[PDB]
Design an enzyme around this catalytic site. Structure first.
Site, short mmCIF file in Angstrom:
data_model
loop_
_atom_site.label_atom_id
_atom_site.label_comp_id
_atom_site.label_asym_id
_atom_site.label_seq_id
_atom_site.Cartn_x
_atom_site.Cartn_y
_atom_site.Cartn_z
N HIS A 94 0.83 -1.20 0.00
CA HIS A 94 0.00 0.00 0.00
C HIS A 94 0.87 1.25 0.00
O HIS A 94 1.94 1.27 0.60
CB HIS A 94 -0.94 0.03 1.20
CG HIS A 94 -2.01 1.06 1.09
ND1 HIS A 94 -1.83 2.37 1.46
CD2 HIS A 94 -3.28 0.98 0.61
CE1 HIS A 94 -2.94 3.05 1.23
NE2 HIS A 94 -3.83 2.23 0.71
N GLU A 164 -2.86 2.57 -7.39
CA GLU A 164 -3.04 3.80 -6.65
C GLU A 164 -2.41 4.97 -7.39
O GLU A 164 -1.18 5.04 -7.50
CB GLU A 164 -2.42 3.70 -5.26
CG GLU A 164 -2.92 2.54 -4.44
CD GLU A 164 -2.34 2.57 -3.05
OE1 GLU A 164 -1.35 1.85 -2.80
OE2 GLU A 164 -2.86 3.34 -2.22
#
Ligand SMILES: [K+]
Ligand code: NA
Lengths: 247, 245
Positions: A94, A164
């Site tokens: 992440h 992302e």
């Protein structure tokens, strides 16, 4: 077979038992569509708690894990512990792990290999920063990140790729649906060329940029966007609208 | 100074095995003059607190420095308290040297944890190359100072000295070498805080301790207890709890 629409809700470092209890109550009450895979990622202290309260229709993910099953790693948890808590996914790579806590691609790769070996599903995150995009190396960055992941995947059936657009998170920049689609299309093309056609066809590539109840349907209609990894909005009733982005 | 024995389970255990460990600890007659804390893996803080007898306190193994936010993979002191834990371990050698946590970050974590009502087990310690260079004193005093900058009320702080130079290196620390460092650290507290804090603050030893060695270490005048690693997962931990009996 169509790629099943996938919506992950990353609660990040938010909530306590009471407020997450309310959040979970709202999700249990919501009628999730058939052929829509929903996953929630609570704070690590609440994985067990969340799995107990959430309806089995919703899967639980850990927000991170380490690369061996046990050891002298104060502050970490292993895939074994995550499974033991009834969770079936883990989020790895992440943007916050990479850029706040400096997790390298190598380490993320080792984590993916271990999590998959242990029988967990992996939501593997990639994405370029603003200075990387503005320098015109979006492609190089996300391809290299995906390569390290791919080198550590032996079964893609358990993997979801999350793009992302870090360049459009907290920078004041916005990504259009076409910009999302552009990266997703390239990523699937990379899978096709470097892994296999079957893996390119079957692997969910979900979008991790800004998405709202008003914009999710348009993003979800892009041919190579297979769903979302939702941050802030996963804490709000708005998450239900995003689950229903294909309806 | 109430004797203080912390058990750091590190990244070990599942519900089955940890439930068995907890059953053993619950059965243990805990000495009245000894404060016992267990630090489970983060996924098991809640589980551990549920199963553990209240006579034993629960610690998180780490935390971050704000109450909520976009920090995937982290937990806050607020969550720790919410799970019934009353302590957090900060600056453990593994965090510093495997996960690259800086003194600055650790200091900020200490300030936030204390402000949010948690007790802190703050860890310090020098590596082998640092020790052999003769800068033990420097390294640990500086680490301690960054912690101290972020401490106002020491009633909720425990300092843990880890002889990192003796972990898998080929060197081990004698009780005399442990006492030596501990004695200096207390004098540090006496020098830069207050004699009261020095007398009242527990400084615990985070090096190798066993049932066979705990009594001699505990007899050292400035060793106020232990932060136990591997032995904390075994019945041997009860021997270490009994170190001053
Ligand atoms: K689509
Ligand atoms: Na009791």
């Amino acid at each position: 077979p169509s790629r099943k629409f996938f919506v992950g809700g990353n609660w990040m470092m938010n909530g306590r038992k009471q407020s997450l209890g309310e959040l979970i109550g709202t999700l249990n009450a919501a009628k999730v569509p058939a052929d829509t895979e929903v996953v929630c990622a609570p704070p690590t202290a609440y994985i067990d708690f969340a799995r107990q309260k959430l309806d089995p229709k919703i899967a639980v993910a850990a927000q991170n894990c380490y690369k061996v099953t046990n050891g002298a790693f104060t502050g970490e948890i292993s895939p074994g512990m995550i499974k033991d808590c009834g969770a079936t996914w883990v989020v790895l790579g992440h943007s916050e792990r990479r850029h706040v806590f400096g997790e390298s691609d190598e380490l993320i790769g080792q984590k993916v290999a271990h999590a998959l070996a242990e029988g967990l599903g992996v939501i593997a995150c990639i994405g370029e920063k603003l200075d990387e995009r503005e320098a015109g190396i979006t492609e190089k960055v996300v391809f290299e990140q995906t390569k390290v992941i791919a080198d550590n995947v032996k079964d893609w059936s358990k993997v979801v790729l999350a793009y992302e657009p870090v360049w459009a998170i907290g920078t004041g920049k916005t990504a259009t649906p076409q910009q999302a689609q552009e990266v997703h299309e390239k990523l699937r093309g990379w899978l096709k060329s470097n892994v296999s056609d079957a893996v390119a066809q079957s692997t969910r590539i979900i979008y991790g940029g800004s998405v709202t109840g008003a914009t999710c349907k348009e993003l979800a209609s892009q041919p190579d966007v297979d769903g979302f990894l939702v941050g802030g909005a996963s804490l709000k009733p708005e998450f239900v609208d995003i689950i229903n982005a294909k309806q």
